[PDB]
């Protein structure tokens, strides 16, 4: 998309002018299609105080295809797997070119507060979330401390 860079520039400027709460992101190096992000664990969650890094790759077709967002920090969450993949609706079928990386980051932060156990990337964690929520919560706390 001859116009993807202009849009990533628009978004860089606005994540700068009006940043998402408990989040930051920006380019890494001379490669504008490659961002990194930091998300602070939300306080009303077992991720509280944890500091999570994310890798972002904008597709050549951006904003028509969603960014590919991966956690680089290890994390115990039913919608996030070993490779850092995030099962999030707006990264998949609910993407629109009218969405922004800021909105993506805020939805990820909401996902940390409110997991979706019924659309899991990790079945065992999802099951523990539904059946013994404090076991999941304690582990999420342990992992936040060890890895984040």
């Amino acid at each position: 998309f001859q116009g993807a860079l202009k849009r990533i520039n628009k978004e860089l400027n606005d994540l700068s002018k009006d940043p998402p709460t408990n989040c930051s992101a920006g380019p890494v190096g001379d490669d504008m299609f490659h961002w990194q992000a930091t998300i602070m664990g939300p306080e009303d969650s077992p991720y509280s105080g944890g500091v999570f890094f994310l890798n972002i790759h904008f597709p050549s077709d951006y904003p028509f295809k969603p960014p590919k967002v991966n956690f680089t920090t290890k994390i115990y969450h039913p919608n996030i797997n070993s490779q850092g993949a995030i099962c999030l609706d707006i990264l998949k079928d609910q993407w629109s070119p009218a969405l922004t990386i800021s909105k993506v980051l805020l939805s990820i932060s909401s996902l940390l507060t409110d997991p979706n156990p019924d659309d899991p990337l990790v079945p065992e964690i999802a099951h523990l979330y539904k059946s013994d929520r404090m076991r999941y919560d304690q582990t999420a706390r342990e992992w936040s401390q060890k890895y984040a």
Side-chain angles (χ1 to χ4, degrees), residues 1 3-4 7-9 11 14 16 18-29 31-42 44-67 69-129 131-134 136-145 147-148:
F1 178 50
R7 162 68 178 265
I8 293 158
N9 280 352
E11 288 202 29
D14 305 355
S16 95
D18 201 275
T21 302
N22 298 316
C23 294
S24 96
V28 41
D31 187 5
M32 211 80 80
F33 290 67
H34 186 199
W35 293 24
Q36 289 183 340
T38 42
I39 298 184
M40 291 187 56
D44 58 355
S45 85
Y47 308 98
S48 189
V51 177
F52 301 91
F53 291 87
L54 298 91
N55 190 70
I56 306 170
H57 288 268
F58 291 93
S60 52
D61 298 330
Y62 192 74
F64 299 113
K65 291 192 194 176
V69 187
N70 270 53
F71 276 75
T72 57
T73 308
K74 192 180 186 197
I75 197 181
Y76 190 80
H77 188 291
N79 305 104
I80 312 160
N81 72 16
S82 284
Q83 286 176 24
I86 307 153
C87 183
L88 186 62
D89 287 333
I90 65 156
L91 294 176
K92 305 167 84 140
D93 55 289
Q94 285 194 24
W95 178 254
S96 164
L99 306 170
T100 60
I101 194 73
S102 175
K103 296 174 197 175
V104 167
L105 293 175
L106 289 165
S107 315
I108 294 164
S109 179
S110 297
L111 190 68
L112 302 188
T113 299
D114 295 304
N116 298 129
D118 299 317
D119 197 6
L121 288 187
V122 199
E124 173 72 354
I125 304 182
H127 170 76
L128 269 149
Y129 184 93
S131 83
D132 190 0
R133 200 178 143 183
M134 293 324 313
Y136 147 82
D137 227 67
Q138 183 61 37
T139 310
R141 293 189 184 283
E142 287 180 4
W143 282 37
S144 308
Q145 190 66 25
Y147 310 102

